[PDB]
Design a protein around this ligand. Sequence first.
Ligand SMILES: CC(=O)N[C@H]1[C@@H](OP(=O)(O)O)O[C@H](CO)[C@@H](O)[C@@H]1O
Length: 355
Amino acid sequence: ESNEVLFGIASHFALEGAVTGIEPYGDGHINTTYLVTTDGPRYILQQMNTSIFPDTVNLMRNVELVTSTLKAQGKETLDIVPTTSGATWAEIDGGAWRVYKFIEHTVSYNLVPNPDVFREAGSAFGDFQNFLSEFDASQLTETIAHFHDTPHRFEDFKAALAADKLGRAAACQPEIDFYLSHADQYAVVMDGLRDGSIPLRVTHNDTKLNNILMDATTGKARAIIDLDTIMPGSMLFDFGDSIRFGASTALEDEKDLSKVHFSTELFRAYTEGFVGELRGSITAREAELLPFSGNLLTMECGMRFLADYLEGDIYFATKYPEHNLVRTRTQIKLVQEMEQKASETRAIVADIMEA
Ligand SMILES: CC(=O)N[C@H]1[C@@H](OP(=O)(O)O)O[C@H](CO)[C@@H](O)[C@@H]1O
């Protein structure tokens, strides 16, 4: 996006300083995000991806409900900066744009640097789930259908595979066959939700580590910062996805696979934090599935990366042609180690399930 256009977008919002610069920012794969520097405060400017979130009204209604409820409890959250006409987002030339106050005095991580950071992440996400349980499922309409319905994701994967639109399949048979051969594992959570053996809860659904800001002084979680996929789900979606991103010893798109490991110690630290908040609500079935929810969300996200690769990278932002193939391979490597360490993680959860 050109500067002139971006600065044009910025003039629609009630900013409280003269804009000095607007630059791409952060690692979100879906929305396009910019840091707005002014002669005063800073702001996050985002373009909402309307092919992924077609219902902008419903999405902004959810974000607005979640944020306003958090504000009404004196909890720090994302602060929508309204347009100059007081709307919570602006439609400009076929684009959908919103502005958040920049969250000051924070750090965030793409890679956990020690167990204490990750424990705090589990504590923050566990507590977020407590907060979300105050809502009826009916107040928070799904903003994307079948979002962690892994069998439905596998259907998309299969169709992308059979289409093989770019002829990319030939160079990634091992990765493809990994997802094919695990097909029998995908329905466990959806089946549990459908038959009542796993409770339906309002969940965050994108709980990767870089969606929590930590205070730069105290190290405590300050705010959860990507509220877009809050909707009904399983607690296991939030748990498994955190483990997926944050129990790795390497970046999601690490090119050197020898650096990619699943850390049981990181698994333990997140679990202590997370289960420590949710001890009084976690059911026996949920506890039983905690380790495998890691496998499941890693496989779901990995298959999505691979599907996108095969489709010519139409869903996730990428920085080079193979980026999605590189991403899928870290996910596969992590699942391989999670399988191998399954009894260790079962023991870790059992241990912790004794507060
Ligand atoms: C709406 C959507 O598809 N969000 C994706 C997307 O999250 P972002 O926070 O938008 O980068 O990338 C994640 C993988 O890094 C994936 O886990 C998640 O489901």
